[PDB]
Design a protein around this nucleic acid. Structure first.
Length: 733
RNA sequence: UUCUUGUCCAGGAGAGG
DNA sequence: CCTCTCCTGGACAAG
């Protein structure tokens, strides 16, 4: 049914003709009828339908003489009406492997979310446009446009040598190469330029065209390319929605004969060039996208990314009429639709890697399933893949840059191909995964309301929120942690750094609407002449913010409702520090004490600490008197002594007492004691407060110190040793 | 980095306090 | 010992 392309010769020149069932009269390029007398003028139905001069011409079609009425055309190919050659019978195209298009049709009607009476109407619609759907693997369409001149550079790239590639990919690529040859997309032709080719393994391979040398010479097309975050916010969220997929839209757009030389590549000795734009060329995405947005530009409320088309309506009848209208445009143009990659009439549909629901835009269930079954990384490539996968939800949850900063910092400390992974990093990953599992759907931007941003900043991170004026649910989130440069900023300066990032994404989300900024800033006019001593940044950062005030469309306010995060300190950590194996600690400290009754005196106490590095080795040992002091005082001074010695050694260190009280109190209350001025439950000064202060500050200077006490074990041997030393100290008095 | 969108890395070259 | 600028060469995700 998708017919075939047949050759045609006009004025003793070979050309390519397409048998068009919809064309009433045949058309020929303009450069061929310039020296001929027109019969007259007739209305010709195009997509732009103004009359052109009609002619009468004779030419050879497949070696057969024909005579017919013709009109001018800007194309480089010939269009042939079926009426003019009634002798010709259409021959269906033959490729390598056929698609279960009938099965694709049934999958789309079954997973369609309508009543049975509406399914019958849509089923007849799908059967009617059977020519539109891709019925063969690697099938390509024929877009009715003037070919693209892509060799628009003023200099040529150097030919590139081609290396050998894997043998198993070679026959998998040969199946698609032959398919593109039989459709006329690839022709075996030599050229001055040649580009390398390498294969990427498919999950079942694939072919990539390294076009770096070519792209370094071709200028950017004037058509800008859409941003994924912008089209997802600016789309309409109706109940009945559908997404259509154009299969190989790149290979449906022809290119001019004078530009095909640049698309050459050597495969198995022979050299091939492209009749249509290839994937990997610089401007090929922009021309495809710009073309498809132009056809459905008249159709309202419809987003479109590369090879996917999305729209939505509230009436199922309205949705059915749009599909017919869209299918007509795609068939008249020359595109083909992949049914296995498209979804129609679904309350919930996955568009651009995200699920569009009634509730709002949301993550894919398959994406959430992929998150949970993620192992801990082992190499740099593994970690990079994990980070890139996780990034999809940066706009979905605030504090994303906060919670992911350590992993991004771990990639910088990583050398070679191995990254230093710890048991604290895996707990971070499970926390990341759980936070992503507890995600929430966002709202969609509307063109009527002016965009409003709400931003607030802690001394460590700035937080951004995107809403609509009077809206409840936010459109997106944004977070940015301050760098080492930005952390030394004044809090006023940190708020402006946060506003900077908010305004770039706001411009992408503005949609030609005024922007309102809610922030803890009290005024902006006074910020223009801020005195220099209050500035901790340089002139450059201050100039960009001053430049933002000159924009009248945006306006700023002071939202006192915002939480005060500028002066709040970090809360007490409740996570228990995981312990490394005893061979991984730089040194291990065992501390002990003693109390002995003494002759009008209470005690004769002593201290006992040992320096041990790991087998186990006694590096240093200490035994000293303390005099008239309680047993608990000797223990606290013992673990204090080890904290100072631990401060001297680099790397994680482990300290153990034989007193559960000191170890338990240190882990459970030393942070609270640090803040409340070292007072007890009765709001009274602790005993040994000066000793607690020294332990406190030694714990802050070296935060990888782990205090714990467990006391027959491995630590029992040295606990007994340190206990022996405490007695000897006590006696020397 | 085939290319698009997005988040990052490194190298080099310099200039400023 | 910082900070900022602009050029080049790269990494990952899924389209």
């Amino acid at each position: 049914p998708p017919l075939l392309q047949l050759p045609v010769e006009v004025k003793k020149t070979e050309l390519n003709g397409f048998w068009d069932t919809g064309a009433q009269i045949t058309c020929i390029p303009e450069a061929f009828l310039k020296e001929e007398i027109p019969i007259g003028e007739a209305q010709i139905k195009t997509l732009h339908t103004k009359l052109q001069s009609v002619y009468y011409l004779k030419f050879k079609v497949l070696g057969r003489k024909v005579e017919a009425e013709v009109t001018t055309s800007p194309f480089d190919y010939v269009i042939i009406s079926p009426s003019d050659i009634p002798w010709y019978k259409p021959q269906p195209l033959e490729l390598t492997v056929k698609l279960p298009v009938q099965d694709f049709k049934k999958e789309l009607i079954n997973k369609a979310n309508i009543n049975n009476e509406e399914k019958k109407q849509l089923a007849k619609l799908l059967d009617k446009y059977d020519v539109l759907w891709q019925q063969w693997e690697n099938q390509v369409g024929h877009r009715k446009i003037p070919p693209h001149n892509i060799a628009t550079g003023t200099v040529a790239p150097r030919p590139q040598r081609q290396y050998h590639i894997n043998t198993k990919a070679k026959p998998s690529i040969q199946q698609v190469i032959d398919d593109l040859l039989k459709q006329g997309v690839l022709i075996k032709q030599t050229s001055v330029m040649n580009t390398p080719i390498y294969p990427v393994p498919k999950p079942d391979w694939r072919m990539v065209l390294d076009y770096r040398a070519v792209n370094k010479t071709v200028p950017l097309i004037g058509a800008q390319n859409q941003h994924s975050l912008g089209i997802l916010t600016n789309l309409v969220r109706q109940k009945y929605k559908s997404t259509i997929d154009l299969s190989n839209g790149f290979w449906a757009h022809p290119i001019t004969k004078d530009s095909q030389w640049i698309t050459a590549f050597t495969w198995e000795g022979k050299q091939h060039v492209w009749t249509r734009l290839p994937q990997g060329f610089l401007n090929s995405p922009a021309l495809f996208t710009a073309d498809v947005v132009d056809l459905l530009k008249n159709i309202p409320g419809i987003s479109v990314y590369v090879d996917d088309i999305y729209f939505s309506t509230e009436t199922v009848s309205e949705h059915l009429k749009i599909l017919e209208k869209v299918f007509k445009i795609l068939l008249e143009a020359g595109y083909i639709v992949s049914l296995k990659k498209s979804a129609l009439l679904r309350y919930e549909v996955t568009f651009l890697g995200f699920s569009i629901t009634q509730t709002g835009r949301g993550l894919t269930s398959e994406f959430k399933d992929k998150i949970q079954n993620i192992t801990s990384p082992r190499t740099l490539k593994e970690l990079q893949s994990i980070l890139g996968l996780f990034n999809f939800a940066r706009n979905f949850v605030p504090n994303f840059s906060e919670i992911i900063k350590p992993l991004y910092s771990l990639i910088s400390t990583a050398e070679g191909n191995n990254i230093k992974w710890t048991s604290e990093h895996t707990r971070y990953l499970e926390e990341i995964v759980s936070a992503l599992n507890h995600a929430g759907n966002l709202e969609q931007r509307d063109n009527e309301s002016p965009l409003v941003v709400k931003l607030n900043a802690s001394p460590k991170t700035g937080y951004i929120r995107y809403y609509n004026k009077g809206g409840q649910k936010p459109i997106a989130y944004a977070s940015h942690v301050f760098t080492n440069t930005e952390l030394k900023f004044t809090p006023l300066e940190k708020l402006l750094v946060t506003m900077h990032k908010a305004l770039i994404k706001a411009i992408d989300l503005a949609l030609g609407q005024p922007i309102e900024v809610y922030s803890p800033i009290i005024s902006m006019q006074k910020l223009q002449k801020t005195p220099l001593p209050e500035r901790k940044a340089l002139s450059t950062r201050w100039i960009t913010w001053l430049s933002y005030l000159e924009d009248p469309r945006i306006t700023f306010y002071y939202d006192k409702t915002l939480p005060d995060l500028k002066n709040v300190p970090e809360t007490v950590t409740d996570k228990k520090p995981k312990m490394l194996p005893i061979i991984e600690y730089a040194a291990v400290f065992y501390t002990n004490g003693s109390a002995i009754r003494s002759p009008n005196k209470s005690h004769s106490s002593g201290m006992g600490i040992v320096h041990a590095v790991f087998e186990l080795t006694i590096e240093h040992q200490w035994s000293i008197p303390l005099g008239d002091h309680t047993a608990q005082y000797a223990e606290i001074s013992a673990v204090e002594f080890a904290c100072k010695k631990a401060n001297n050694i680099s790397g994680p260190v482990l300290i153990v007492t034989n007193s559960d009280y000191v170890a338990r109190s240190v882990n459970e209350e030393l942070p609270f004691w640090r803040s409340n001025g070292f007072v007890n439950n009765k709001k009274k000064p602790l005993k040994h407060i000066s000793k607690w202060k020294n332990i406190s500050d030694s714990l802050l200077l070296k935060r990888d110190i782990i205090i714990v006490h467990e006391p027959t074990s491995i630590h029992t041997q040295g606990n007994n040793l340190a206990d022996k030393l405490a007695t000897q100290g006590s006696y020397t008095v």
